[PDB]
Write a protein that binds this DNA or RNA. Sequence first.
RNA 1: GGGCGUGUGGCGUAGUCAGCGCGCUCCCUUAGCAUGGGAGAGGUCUCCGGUUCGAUUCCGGACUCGUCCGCCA
RNA 2: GGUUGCGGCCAUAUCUACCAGAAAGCACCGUUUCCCGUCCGAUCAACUGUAGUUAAGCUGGUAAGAGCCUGACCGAGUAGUGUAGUGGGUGACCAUACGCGAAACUCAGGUGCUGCAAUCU
RNA 3: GAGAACAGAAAUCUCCAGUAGAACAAAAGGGUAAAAGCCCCCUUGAUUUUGAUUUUCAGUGUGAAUACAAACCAUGAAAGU
RNA 4: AAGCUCGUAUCAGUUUUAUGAGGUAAAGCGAAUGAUUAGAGGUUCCGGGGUCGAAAUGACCUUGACCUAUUCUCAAACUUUAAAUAUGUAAGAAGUCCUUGUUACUUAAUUGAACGUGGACAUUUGAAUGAAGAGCUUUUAGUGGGCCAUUUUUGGUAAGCA
Lengths: 169, 71, 294, 142, 159
Amino acid sequence: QNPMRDLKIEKLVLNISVGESGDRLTRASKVLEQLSGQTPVQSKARYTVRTFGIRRNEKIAVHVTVRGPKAEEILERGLKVKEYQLRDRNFSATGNFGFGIDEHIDLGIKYDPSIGIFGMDFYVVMNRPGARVTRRKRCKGTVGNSHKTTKEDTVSWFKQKYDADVLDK
Amino acid sequence: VEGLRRARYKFPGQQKIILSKKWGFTNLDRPEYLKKREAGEVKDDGAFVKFLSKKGSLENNIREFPEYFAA
Amino acid sequence: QKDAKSSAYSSRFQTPFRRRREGKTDYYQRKRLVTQHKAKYNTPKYRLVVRFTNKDIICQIISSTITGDVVLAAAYSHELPRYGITHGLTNWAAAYATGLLIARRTLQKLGLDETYKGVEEVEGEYELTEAVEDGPRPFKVFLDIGLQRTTTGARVFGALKGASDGGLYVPHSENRFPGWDFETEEIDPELLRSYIFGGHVSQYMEELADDDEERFSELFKGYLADDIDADSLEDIYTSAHEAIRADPAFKPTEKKFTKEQYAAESKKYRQTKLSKEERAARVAAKIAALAGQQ
Amino acid sequence: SATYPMQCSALRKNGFVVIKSRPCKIVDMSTSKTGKHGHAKVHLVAIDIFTGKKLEDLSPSTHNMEVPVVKRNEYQLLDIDDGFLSLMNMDGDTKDDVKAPEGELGDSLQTAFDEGKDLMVTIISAMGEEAAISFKEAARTD
Amino acid sequence: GKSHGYRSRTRYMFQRDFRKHGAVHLSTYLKVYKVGDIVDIKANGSIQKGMPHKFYQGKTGVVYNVTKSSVGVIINKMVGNRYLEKRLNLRVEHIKHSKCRQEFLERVKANAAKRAEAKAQGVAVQLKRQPAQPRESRIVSTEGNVPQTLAPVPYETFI
RNA sequence: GGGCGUGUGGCGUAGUCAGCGCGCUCCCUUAGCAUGGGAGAGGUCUCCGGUUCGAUUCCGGACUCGUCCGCCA
RNA sequence: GGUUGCGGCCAUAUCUACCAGAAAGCACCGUUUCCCGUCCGAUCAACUGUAGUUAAGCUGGUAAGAGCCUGACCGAGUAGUGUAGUGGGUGACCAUACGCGAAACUCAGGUGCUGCAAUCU
RNA sequence: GAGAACAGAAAUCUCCAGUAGAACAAAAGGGUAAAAGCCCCCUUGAUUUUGAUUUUCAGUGUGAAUACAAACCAUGAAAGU
RNA sequence: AAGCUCGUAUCAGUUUUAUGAGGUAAAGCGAAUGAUUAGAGGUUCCGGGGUCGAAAUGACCUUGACCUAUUCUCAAACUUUAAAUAUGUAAGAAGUCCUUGUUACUUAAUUGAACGUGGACAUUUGAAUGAAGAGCUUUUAGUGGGCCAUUUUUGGUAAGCA
C-alpha cells in the first residue's frame, strides 16, 4: 500500500548556459555559487558549432546540484517566482519536472552593476526511497514497476504539497 | 493460359504452364483453405490473409480472430 | 508500447555470467587472483575473502577447484560474542578481530600455530610475518576484497591487519591504513593502534556524550544498556584478542532442529509449479470464460 | 632530412624541385618521346623562389630529381630597422634574423609600416636560407 | 601484389562463435598440464598473446615444457616429403586435453582389470577389440506384424 | 581510344573537416597633388550521393572544357 | 527445503506484465566526529543496528507469453555430395548403380542444475 | 524517447530504454562492456645480457612475433601485469 | 651407383573404433548486415500537394517518410545453421599398477615436478588388412619451355584461348 512510497526531491540541478567563456562565465558561476552555497561545476562543449560560435571544450555552461532541505528552499523560492503555476508540458513521463526563470532579482539576490543579469534553468528530480538499488556498485538492479515514479503521481504530489495548481496546457 | 502462352515466346529456353492446386497466392490447398475459411481463423489483409495459430498469448488471439472463438 | 524488445534482439542477446548478472563477482579480478603458475602444478592459491554486509563481517580462506571453490576455514563477526565483543560488529576493530580470529583458526587447523605466533604485543607498526629459518614457511594468503572500493581507512585493510598480526603472511603495503600521511610517505603507528583498540569510536562517544545526549540515547543505546563506557572498550578488545589467542577452535551452533525439520516448513511454504494437464485445463477454462461470450 | 628524392613523372606543376642546388618552383612541364622506341624525356621550366631566375632542365622520365622541403610560416611584425625585420611568433617567440625584402614588396611593406598598419608576414624556409614573400593585414583582432 | 601475412585468411577461423563472446571461463585456467600430455590446439581470438599460427589450428601434439602461463607443444609438420618437428609456445587458453587419450587409458585400466579378474580362472580373456561382425541368424514373426504391401506412387505437380 | 589537368558571385582567384581582390551600386569625405572611407548588391564553391562534428576541402559516380598521345609493320 | 559468502557450467538461468514471500539472512534504511572522496556524505568513506519497512532489490509462482534448450520414422532419405558407365540429351542439364547425408519447416516436451562453508522454524 | 529561460534541427542540464548498432592513429578483417572504450593518478619494461621457438623457408638471411632464464625497475592493497 | 647396421621391425598414398578441427556445397532472410516487390493498420507540437476554409500546432482527401503485423525475390568479398569428400591424434613393453630414493626446483608441509631403485602383469601384448625385407649414409647425372582428359573453378561472347 503506502509504507515508504512517499515521494521526495532527489536533487535540484540549476543550469546556466552563458554560451561563451570568460567574464560572463565567471559572473554566472559566482551567482550560482552564492545561491547554492557550494562551488559550481563548469561543463565543456562537446562539438564545435559555427552558428552559436562555440568550439570544442571552452566550459560554456555552469551548473550546480543541491540536495536536501536547502534544495527544497531554493525550489520554494523558484515556485514563488513562478507564482506556483506550471505548465503540464513541464512535467515528464518519468516524473521529473523542471522550469526556466529569468533573472535572480526575482529570487532576491539584489543587483550589482558588475555581475549583470542571468536567467536560470531549475530541474527537480523525484524519487522514492529505495533508489540506492540502481546507484550502488554491488548487486546493481532495476527498480520495480509499481515503485517507479510517474507523471500522475508527481502532479498529484505537486498539487498536494506547495498548494499549487498545474495549467491544463 | 493464353496470356502466359503468349508471354512464353519472349523467354529463351523451355517453360511450362501449370495450374496449381493451391488457393490463389497462398500455400494451402483448395479444400484445406475452404475448411479453414469456414471457421474464422483466417482474417484478410490488404491482399493476403493472416492465419490463426495455437501458439501465442490468448488475449491477442482473441482481439484478433473473434469468430473462431465464437464457437 | 515503448519498452518493447524484439524477438531478434532477444534471440541475438548473449547473457553474461550468472555472478556478473547478480553483480557479485568481478571476473577480471578473479582471473588474476585464482590462476596459478603452471610449473606449480596442483598447488592451491589461497584467498582471504573479506566481505562486508550490514551487521556482519565475513572472512573466509578459499581455494579454487573446477567443481567449485573450497573453504578451509571461515570466521564471521557474529561469533565475536563468544570472545566478548557484543556491540559494533562491523566497525574497523571488529574487522581486525575477525581477521585475527581467522588467522589463529587457520594456523591451528594447519598445525602451524606453535611456530609463527604473529604479533603478540600489538603496537600498530607495519611489518609482515617473516619466514623463520630451518623450518616451514609461513602460510601465504592473498586478499579478495571483491567489488569494494580501495580507500585509505577502509576496513578490508583492518581485516588484513588483523590477519597479518595473527600470523598469516599476507603481502601488503602500509599506505591504505588509517593514519597514513600522504605528503610525508610514512605510517603513523599510534593512530593505527588507537583504531585497533577502538579509539575512533570512543573519542566520538566522549565528544558526543558531552554535548548532544539525545543522539547518545539514539545511537550507543546498547552501550548504556550494557553499561559500556568509553574507556573500557580498549580492555575488552584486549581481552577479546587474548581469548582469540587462547582458542579459535570454532564450536558451531546446535541448530535447534534438523535439516528435514526446517525443510518440512519451508517446503510447505514454497510455491510449486503447475503441471501440463492442469495448465491445459486452465487455458480451456479461460477460453470458455472470455471467448465463450461471457 | 632537408631534402627528399622524387621521380620526374611524379613531379607536377606548382611543386618544388632542386635545380643546380637551388630551390625552384615549376611553371612548365613538357614530355616528348626521345625516339619512337624510346622513353619520353621531361623538360622542366622552373623559377627560383628567392632570386626569381628562370632555370630549365631536361631529364629521363624515370630519373629521380631532388626535392626540397619548403615551410611557409606566419608572423606579426614588430619593427623594421636597418633592413632586418623583427617578427613575433605565436606563444610569444621573437626572431630578428630575417632580412627585409629589397623589392617593391619591401617598399610597400616599408610604407605600410610607416603609415601604421598591423602587417602579417609570410616567410618561407627552404634549404637553410630564409626570406619573406608576402604580407597582408589582419582584418579582425585589431 | 599478393599478401601472405601471419594471420592471412583467418577470418572465420579466428571469429569467436555465436553468443559466446567475451571473457573466458576459469576452467581453462584451472586445468593442469604435465609433460607428456596430449593436447588439441584451438586458438581463442579473444586472447592475442601466445596465439598459434593458422596451420596448427585443429592439430594435436605432445607437451614438452611447462612455464608460467604457457605450454610447449610438439607438432609434426609435413614439409615437402618428410615430417619436421615443430616446437610451439602457446598460452593455455588455446589448448585443451585430448579426450581420445583418456578414453584409451580408461580402456587400459578396464582391460587390466578384466585380465586380473580372469587370471584367477583362465577363461581365454580375449582382450583385443573386434570390429562389427556380420549379424547372425534370427527368426522374425508375423504375430501382429502381417506384411503391408507397398507400391510406387504416381507423379504429381505439388506446387 | 586513352591519359592528365579544369570548372567558386559582374570579373578574377583562394582555402581549414563560402572568402577576399577588382569592379559595381549607394552614402559620406576630400582646395588637393590625388581622392579616401564606410556600407551594401553579389556565389546550387561543375553537379549528385556518401563520409565526416563539418565538406571547396575527403571519397564514389557523372558532366564541362582545355591539353598530350594513338607507334613499327 | 529457505537464506547468506565464495563459486562451476554460463539464458532450461534471459526479457515482458502481474501475484506471493512464515522464520532467519540479505536488502532498503538512521548519522557525519573520526579515515576518505565528491559541485552535491547521491555513489564512495566512516559510525550506529539504534528510529522503521517488505514498498523496492532478492527469491518463487503465473502466461494457448517472446526468447532459449531437448527430441521426433516432422519435413526428408529431400537438397547437396564421393565413386561408375562407349548412360540420355544439339545443348542446358538430367536419370540410374554402389555409398554418405543436411538446413529451414511442422509437432511434442522443458524453463536452471549443482560444489564448499555457515545459518534458519 | 520524454523534459528545462534566452536555446531553435544541432550549445548545457535531468531521467528512461539501449549486446555495442560507438570507440579503439591509419586500409580491411578479427577482438574487446565493472573493458582493450572515455576520464583521472603514477611512471618509463620503447631498459641490460645473450640463447630457444613461430611465419615466409633451402627449414638460409631479413622483417615481424611468441615463451622463458639472469638482473634492474614501474604500478597496485595485492594477486599479478 | 656404392654400400653400411640389422633380421620381420620405432612400418603403410588403406580401413575400423574413439576423439578433434574446418565455414565450402546446401540452406536462411515473418534471424543480424545489405539489396528488394506489394498492399494493410497506425503516428503527426511530427511532412508535402490540392479542395473546403477569415485564418487556425484548422478540417477533408491524396502522396511521401517512420513504426507495427504481413508478403515476393537475392548475396564471391552476408549469416543463426551446416554436410559429402579431404584432414590431426590415439589403438601400450619407450605400457600400466604398487613401494620409496635424489634435488640447489616448487610447496604452509615428503606437498608436488622430473628422473630413478625394487616388485607384479607376456603371446589376443591390446582393432583390420598387407609387408614385397626394415633402418641409415655418401656421392653424382639429367631436369628446372611442358601439354591433354574427367571433375571443381577464374578472366573472356567465345576459342584447338589464357
